[PDB]
Scaffold this active site. Sequence first.
Site, PDB file in Angstrom:
ATOM      1  N   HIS A   2      10.974  -2.818  -2.309  1.00  0.00           N
ATOM      2  CA  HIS A   2      10.722  -2.469  -2.964  1.00  0.00           C
ATOM      3  C   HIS A   2      10.909  -0.865  -2.314  1.00  0.00           C
ATOM      4  CE1 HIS A   2       8.071   0.306  -5.914  1.00  0.00           C
ATOM      5  NE2 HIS A   2       9.745  -0.039  -6.532  1.00  0.00           N
ATOM      6  N   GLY A  13       0.252  -0.590   0.146  1.00  0.00           N
ATOM      7  CA  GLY A  13       0.213   0.255   0.066  1.00  0.00           C
ATOM      8  C   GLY A  13       0.869   1.237   0.359  1.00  0.00           C
ATOM      9  N   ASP A  66      11.709  -1.860  -9.635  1.00  0.00           N
ATOM     10  CA  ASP A  66      10.775  -1.649 -10.259  1.00  0.00           C
ATOM     11  C   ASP A  66      11.088  -3.682 -10.914  1.00  0.00           C
ATOM     12  OD1 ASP A  66       9.641   0.634  -9.310  1.00  0.00           O
ATOM     13  OD2 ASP A  66       9.320   1.001 -10.972  1.00  0.00           O
ATOM     14  N   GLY A 109       2.178   4.794   0.724  1.00  0.00           N
ATOM     15  CA  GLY A 109       2.176   5.468   2.191  1.00  0.00           C
ATOM     16  C   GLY A 109       2.218   4.777   3.346  1.00  0.00           C
TER      17      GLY A 109
END
Length: 121
Positions: free
Chosen positions: A47, A29, A89, A31
């Site tokens: 990540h 998620g 990514d 934030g």
Amino acid sequence: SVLELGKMILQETGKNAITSYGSYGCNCGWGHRGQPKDATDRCCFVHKCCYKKLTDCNHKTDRYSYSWKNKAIICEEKNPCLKEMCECDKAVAICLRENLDTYNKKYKAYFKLKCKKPDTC
């Protein structure tokens, strides 16, 4: 940027990055922060810690070049900060793909639920 990240997640997992992963667990998620709930959320914490290294470029809005060739993501970008952004990514999209066998739609809407404190990168 997020447009390259969303496309690799589609290419690797078949999923919609916003909806399946943009409020999952404690780290994927947008934030979110916290200790990971599962392997899927763990890929997300990894990540973040990879993005945290990017000082000369912005992981959200700078665009980079990459190809999806022979079922693999190849980061063809040459500006160096952008190539590491592509490697970060690429790695989450692969990790998501591998741990799809435990995703769990209930951590799926986790914005309001609880999260212990996150480890350190």
